[PDB]
Amino acid sequence: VTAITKVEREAVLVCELPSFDVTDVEFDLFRARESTDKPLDVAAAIAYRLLLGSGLPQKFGCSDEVLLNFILQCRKKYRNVPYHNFYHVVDVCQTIHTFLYRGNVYEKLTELECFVLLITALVHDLDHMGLNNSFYLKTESPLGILSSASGNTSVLEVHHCNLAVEILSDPESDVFDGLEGAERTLAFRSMIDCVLATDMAKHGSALEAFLASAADQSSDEAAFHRMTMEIILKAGDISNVTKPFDISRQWAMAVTEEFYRQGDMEKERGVEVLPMFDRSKNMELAKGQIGFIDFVAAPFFQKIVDACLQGMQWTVDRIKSNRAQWERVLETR
Ligand SMILES: COc1cccc(NC(=O)C#Cc2cc(C3=NN(C(C)C)C(=O)[C@@H]4CC=CC[C@H]34)ccc2OC)c1
Numbered sequence: 001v002t003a004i005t006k007v008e009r010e011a012v013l014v015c016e017l018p019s020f021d022v023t024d025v026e027f028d029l030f031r032a033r034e035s036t037d038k039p040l041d042v043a044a045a046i047a048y049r050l051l052l053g054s055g056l057p058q059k060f061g062c063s064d065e066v067l068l069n070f071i072l073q074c075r076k077k078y079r080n081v082p083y084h085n086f087y088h089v090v091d092v093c094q095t096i097h098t099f100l101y102r103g104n105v106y107e108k109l110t111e112l113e114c115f116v117l118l119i120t121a122l123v124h125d126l127d128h129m130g131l132n133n134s135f136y137l138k139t140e141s142p143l144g145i146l147s148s149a150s151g152n153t154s155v156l157e158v159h160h161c162n163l164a165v166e167i168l169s170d171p172e173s174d175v176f177d178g179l180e181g182a183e184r185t186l187a188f189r190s191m192i193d194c195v196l197a198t199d200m201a202k203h204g205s206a207l208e209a210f211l212a213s214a215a216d217q218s219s220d221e222a223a224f225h226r227m228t229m230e231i232i233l234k235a236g237d238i239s240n241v242t243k244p245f246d247i248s249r250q251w252a253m254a255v256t257e258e259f260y261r262q263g264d265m266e267k268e269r270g271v272e273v274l275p276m277f278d279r280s281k282n283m284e285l286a287k288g289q290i291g292f293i294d295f296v297a298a299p300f301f302q303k304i305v306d307a308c309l310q311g312m313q314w315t316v317d318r319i320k321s322n323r324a325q326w327e328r329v330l331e332t333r
């Protein structure tokens, strides 16, 4: 944990984002990346602006300097992989902002919980190597053995929580230094519960718990708040198909490259390679995206909007039109 320099901060604060509304559901992070020769500084500046314009750091005694220290300690710990890089967690951060403030999910949570969600977005994939839980277990890699021996199958999610806690133990980058007692505890418990909940192995069980709680006027209030945070970070994590088609498509290309590289190492290591991770299967993006929409994202967003989050209806509208756009790529091939 080397301290952030005056020079590193200045490199972010100078970025100005002319033309961009970071609060908008149609904000394009790809356009912002190649809109300078410092795409990393810009992403950091998008996150800084999102966090300050919410007004939440101020209310919880997090200075502008500590907040930016934190953004930059987070950025140092992401890797040059095609999808689970710093652009992805900044995307999840901005998208969660749209769900909270354009979708009015802010009304369901306290300000501390909204603050936690925006911060968690930035830690939720720390030190991701472009390989899924499954890779580590099948290869009996050290991390996989450690997870298996410890009894926790969520290999990556526990790695991420470990580095989050590392960054927050230095008061110079603890966005929660302003909290004490129950509030500091709730902040850490909820950041950890949310990251652990991004493991897609628990997708069905997290979705069903959230919906059972929303249907129950006598749900425990604390438990409902908690499940709402977990569902919102999960929503942000599978949000690529809720964006304007060309944005959705570039995300999909980036995730496919990352899966294909895992498939290359699984071959050179002679372990099971799924159809989807095999470069020499050349499966069509269109059928891929439609499959993801039909089996994961459409039912997910439709059910949470209907159950509770009416303000997020636009996500369901966009998945419908992205699907029809993929059906058109098929109909004209
Ligand atoms: C038939 O069901 C399918 C299921 C999955 C993919 C496809 N095919 C694609 O073309 C794609 C994509 C795709 C896949 C993901 C993810 N997937 N998952 C599992 C569901 C396999 C992860 O755990 C990733 C890590 C954490 C959260 C979500 C991430 C995210 C965005 C995607 O698109 C832009 C078809």
Ligand SMILES: [Mg+2]
Pocket: 124, 125, 156, 198
């Ligand atoms: Mg993850």
Ligand SMILES: [Zn+2]
Pocket: 088, 092, 124, 125, 198, 237
């Ligand atoms: Zn993620």
